[PDB]
Amino acid sequence: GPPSGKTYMGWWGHMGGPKQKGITSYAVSPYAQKPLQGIFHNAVFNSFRRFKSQFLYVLIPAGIYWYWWKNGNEYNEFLYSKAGREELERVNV
Amino acid sequence: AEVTQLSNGIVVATEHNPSAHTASVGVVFGSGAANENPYNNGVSNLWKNIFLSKENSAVAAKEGLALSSNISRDFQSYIVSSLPGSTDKSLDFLNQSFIQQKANLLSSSNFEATKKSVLKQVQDFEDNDHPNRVLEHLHSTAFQNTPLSLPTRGTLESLENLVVADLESFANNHFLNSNAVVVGTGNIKHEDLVNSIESKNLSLQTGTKPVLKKKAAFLGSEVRLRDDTLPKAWISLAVEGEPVNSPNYFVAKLAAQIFGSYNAFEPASRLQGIKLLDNIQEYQLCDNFNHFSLSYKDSGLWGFSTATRNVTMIDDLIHFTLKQWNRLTISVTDTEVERAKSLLKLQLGQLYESGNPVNDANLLGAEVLIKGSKLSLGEAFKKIDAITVKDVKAWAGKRLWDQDIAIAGTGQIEGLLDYMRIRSDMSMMRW
């Protein structure tokens, strides 16, 4: 076929990575492993960890936005009640 | 074709063959690498090397004797070759080295010069003998945390930390009598050798038995030794095979013959009657391959080994080969079984009957140690010919169909897919 453009990914046997040497991998058949039930006692306290490190990056921005929303809402409610019809004529137009 | 063996104090085994020119004598012990530990691994290989050391070897050479030894998994053997006349002078050198010099061969100047040789030896093996290095690792992962996983030549780490006391410790536990067999092959008669032996008495550590352990077990797993600097990819793959003294020892050995061995460069090899060759030759999937049914005392390995330079099509190599093996359970033909029978006989012949007594010694000792006797070549053929297509199909349906496998490889193995991919090919979809 027609010549192909150079990419950053190849295929099995010429993936494009650097020459590997010295690394040795080991694995055991899924068939010889303990039937799915051991994901507790040993894999329970370890879990939830990948969210104790993150929740702050989510909670603070969330908190900031929740209070901002609640503030403006409660202010709106006041403006349209009887007590605030005076301030409403001030801030409105 | 005579298997003669008698027990008095020591179990003596011999297999005489008139026309021979030479004769070999020695002892074979029922303990090898499968009896060592992860930490004293390599002791047996060390023994073999001192027994063949320049000192000890020069003594028998003056006398006109030659030395030979081999370390295996289930056994070990020390042999002295000589002319048909000096069948007695071998027995002197044998006793002299296993009783008298079982302390002279272990000097602080000999052991250090020998240790330095096995270290350059085993190192050289791991650095260059890739196909054997891979087959050795195959046993390593297939039988992990169990006897058969220990490499015969031993590991460089358990070797450089081995001391003379360890040699002695091992020797005093396995080089016993109840775990030995004195072998004699060549031309000498059973009654000729047995006399020269029952002459010299002395038991030397009698009644003692070697330590016990835990039975060997197979485990579906893999070990990948990727090395992109090598010019090829060497892989070995196998399922749990058959142990020696198994009702299917032969069916298995026949099943391996069906796929046999191949060498893409030898014209005749390309013409063989193996269906697999139709698939692998189109794009030249490999330089060579060879099937095998390795058998040991507790277990075995049935599979194949291969080497290739076509690093972008390894998945097809593995896929086609495993598709062929699927056939053994569902569609193997009569003519394939027959082609195997003939070829098995031819190879089993060339092994049990070559022009070298040392091979005969090892085979004789090894067999008598596991089943108390040797099966005659003619007795084997009768069993081989009795195998039907139904036998192969029943065996494969038990050992090959949807069964775990063991893998090991080195070199450019990026193209060798994941375990579950290979594992899935041990079967076929059906309605």
Swiss-Prot record, chain A:
What GO CC annotations are associated with the protein? mitochondrial inner membrane; mitochondrion; respiratory chain complex III
Please indicate the ranges of residues that lie on the Mitochondrial matrix side.
1-48
Alphabetical list of InterPro entries matching this protein? Cyt_bc1_su8, Cyt_bc1_su8_sf
- Where in or outside the cell is it found? Mitochondrion inner membrane
Q: What membrane topology does this protein have?
A: Single-pass membrane protein
Q: Which Gene3D superfamilies match?
A: Cytochrome b-c1 complex subunit 8
- A Gene Ontology molecular-function term? ubiquinol-cytochrome-c reductase activity
Chain ranges sitting on the Mitochondrial intermembrane side read 80-93
Give the range the annotation lists for the signal sequence. Answer: none
* Disulfide-bond pairs as recorded: none
A Pfam match is UcrQ
Q: How does it assemble?
A: Component of the ubiquinol-cytochrome c oxidoreductase (cytochrome b-c1 complex, complex III, CIII), a multisubunit enzyme composed of 10 subunits. The complex is composed of 3 respiratory subunits cytochrome b (COB), cytochrome c1 (CYT1) and Rieske protein (RIP1), 2 core protein subunits COR1 and QCR2, and 5 low-molecular weight protein subunits QCR6, QCR7, QCR8, QCR9 and QCR10.
Q: Which family, according to the similarity comment?
A: Belongs to the UQCRQ/QCR8 family.
Please give the name of this protein. Cytochrome b-c1 complex subunit 8, mitochondrial
Organism for this UniProt entry: Saccharomyces cerevisiae (strain ATCC 204508 / S288c)
Q: What is the lineage of its organism?
A: Eukaryota, Fungi, Dikarya, Ascomycota, Saccharomycotina
UniProtKB/Swiss-Prot annotation, chain B:
An example Gene Ontology CC term for this record? mitochondrial inner membrane
- What biological-process GO terms show up in the record? aerobic respiration; cellular respiration; mitochondrial electron transport, ubiquinol to cytochrome c; protein processing involved in protein targeting to mitochondrion; proton transmembrane transport
Q: Does the keyword Metal-binding apply?
A: no
Keywords attached to this Swiss-Prot or TrEMBL record, sorted alphabetically, are: Electron transport, Membrane, Mitochondrion, Mitochondrion inner membrane, Respiratory chain, Transit peptide, Transport
Q: How does it sit in the membrane?
A: Peripheral membrane protein
Whether Membrane counts among this entry's keywords is yes
User: Which molecular-function annotations from GO does this UniProt entry contain?
Assistant: metal ion binding; metalloendopeptidase activity
Q: Where in the cell is it found?
A: Mitochondrion inner membrane
What's one Pfam family the UniProt record gives for this protein?
A: Peptidase_M16
| InterPro entries tied to this protein | Metalloenz_LuxS/M16, MPP/UQCRC_Complex, Pept_M16_N, Peptidase_M16_C
Enumerate the transmembrane spans: none
**Per its UniProt entry, which superkingdom is the organism in?**
Eukaryota
Q: What is its main location?
A: mitochondrion
Oligomer status and interactors: Component of the ubiquinol-cytochrome c oxidoreductase (cytochrome b-c1 complex, complex III, CIII), a multisubunit enzyme composed of 10 subunits. The complex is composed of 3 respiratory subunits cytochrome b (COB), cytochrome c1 (CYT1) and Rieske protein (RIP1), 2 core protein subunits COR1 and QCR2, and 5 low-molecular weight protein subunits QCR6, QCR7, QCR8, QCR9 and QCR10.
Note on file?
Present with 19300 molecules/cell in log phase SD medium.
Its family remark reads: Belongs to the peptidase M16 family. UQCRC1/QCR1 subfamily.
Q: What does this protein do?
A: Component of the ubiquinol-cytochrome c oxidoreductase, a multisubunit transmembrane complex that is part of the mitochondrial electron transport chain which drives oxidative phosphorylation.
Name the chain's protein.
Cytochrome b-c1 complex subunit 1, mitochondrial
